[PDB]
Design a protein around this ligand. Structure first.
Ligand SMILES: COc1ccc2cc3[n+](cc2c1OC)CCc1cc2c(cc1-3)OCO2
Length: 121
């Protein structure tokens, strides 16, 4: 759920999910349209696609458990949905940490109208 996702993000990047990653670019948070603006936005795009692979799952509200082993995120065994949701979120948290150097404040609260084009999953 967003509670676990939020905590991963803070742990990885030291930034709070709201508001650093909930209104960023074309894909982070609510949105989903056009071309991702930068690496961080691509992480959100792939994250949206990952959830999109799980029709019959409720990734926003379904809670999973994860632990840290040697600093590494390890998803603990739950239902099938919980496992797969945790793996999507884990990948996004790492992707954010990997692209932290290029995170730009310029893309915070980005315009909807400037999210143009198309990109399939
Ligand atoms: C139902 O309300 C919603 C709806 C959608 C929400 C989406 C997100 N958050 C709260 C939401 C929320 O609650 C305030 C919090 C953090 C976050 C980090 C993210 C992200 C999406 C979100 O994509 C990449 O990184």
């Amino acid at each position: 759920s967003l509670l676990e996702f939020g905590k991963m993000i803070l742990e990885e990047t030291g930034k709070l999910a709201i508001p650093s990653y909930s209104s960023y670019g074309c894909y982070c948070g609510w949105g989903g349209k056009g071309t991702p603006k930068d690496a961080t936005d691509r992480c959100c795009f792939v994250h949206d696609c990952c959830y999109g692979n799980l029709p019959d799952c409720n990734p926003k509200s379904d809670r999973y458990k994860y632990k840290r082993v040697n600093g590494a995120i390890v998803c603990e065994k739950g239902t099938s949905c919980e496992n797969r949701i945790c793996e999507c979120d884990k990948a996004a948290a790492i992707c954010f940490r990997q692209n932290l150097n290029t995170y730009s404040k310029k893309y915070m609260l980005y315009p909807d109208f400037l999210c143009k084009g198309e990109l399939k999953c």
